């Protein structure tokens, strides 16, 4: 079992925090917020680094390029923005979604950005030019998450419509659809670091580890509260192999990935823990919470 202990509470956003992501190089934490701002913090000392601004509505997601130099953000203003981290300048504005942009990610080579939107589409964008290369008619309801696999050849998307879909990046064709016979809305999805599995949250308080090729549910994680919001979940791999997720009871939940037992709950947030992130090399978790809380917490474990 891990022993995550609180190290820092990061205050400064004036509305709900929506998303936190560690830079691939481990130096930085980026956070997006309903307050329209991105904030950059030191990953190891919690020190505020800078504020990046320009979205004229709130931001639901943010993501790092693989070389840690760029960020992409997704906003209620229907655009994504590509930012140069060092300068804080907006390098591109990605236009073409017709409703809120909900989620975003670079591919590993970081020449592409994938976005999902309330307009029910998944868009694939060229980073260099800001051009939209593809609009995928992905879902029949808002798209809650989009994620590339380890080589960028696959995209996984999830939606309130209840489906998890796997797309061939190059052709844009849907390779696989996962269904649950029930339609719980699917609120989050990502590939496992190896790309063999998909981790899917549904709004029935349930996380599931899937083999997408086989189409089998391997693992179920429960005990947390998730019925209303799209909460990020994570594979923790730097120490023990955990599943990490926020929860609507204001706790961070940590499960043993293989046994599915809950191994730790992190207490201290005072609103829904909407987002968690796992540091790439250290046993460090970042968590962030909604309007009653507005803070980010950094937690450290010996394993």
């Amino acid at each position: 079992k891990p022993n995550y202990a609180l190290k820092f509470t990061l205050a400064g956003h004036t509305k709900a925090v929506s998303s936190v992501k560690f830079s691939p190089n481990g130096e930085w934490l980026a956070s997006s917020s309903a307050d329209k701002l991105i904030k950059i913090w030191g990953a190891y000392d919690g020190k505020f680094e800078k504020t990046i601004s320009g979205h004229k509505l709130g931001i639901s997601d943010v993501a790092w390029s693989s070389d840690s130099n760029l960020l992409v953000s997704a906003s209620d203003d229907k655009t994504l923005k590509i930012w140069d981290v060092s300068s804080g300048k907006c390098l591109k504005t990605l236009k073409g979604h017709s409703n809120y942009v909900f989620c975003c990610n670079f591919n590993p080579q970081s020449n592409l950005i994938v976005s999902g939107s309330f307009d029910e589409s998944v868009r694939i964008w060229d980073v260099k030019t800001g051009k939209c290369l593809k609009t995928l008619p992905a879902h029949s309801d808002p798209v809650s998450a989009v994620h590339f696999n380890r080589d960028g050849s696959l995209i996984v998307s999830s939606s309130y419509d209840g489906l998890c879909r796997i797309w061939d990046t190059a052709s844009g064709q849907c390779l696989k659809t996962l269904i649950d016979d029930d339609n719980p809305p699917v609120s989050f999805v990502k590939f496992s670091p190896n790309g063999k599995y998909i981790l899917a949250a549904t709004l029935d308080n349930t996380l599931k580890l899937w083999d997408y090729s086989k189409g089998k549910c391997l693992k179920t994680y429960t005990g947390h509260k998730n019925e209303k919001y799209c909460i990020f979940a994570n594979f923790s791999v730097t120490g023990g192999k955990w599943i990490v997720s926020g929860s609507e009871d204001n706790l961070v939940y940590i499960w043993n990935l293989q046994t599915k037992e809950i191994v730790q709950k992190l207490q201290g947030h005072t609103d829904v823990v909407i987002s968690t992130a796992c540091h790439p090399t250290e046993n460090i978790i970042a968590s962030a919470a909604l309007e009653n809380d507005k803070t980010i917490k950094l937690w450290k474990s010996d394993c």
Partner: peptide
């Protein structure tokens, strides 16, 4: 606010 901090759809 932002879409993710509001109750999903």
């Amino acid at each position: 606010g932002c879409a993710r901090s509001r109750v999903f759809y």
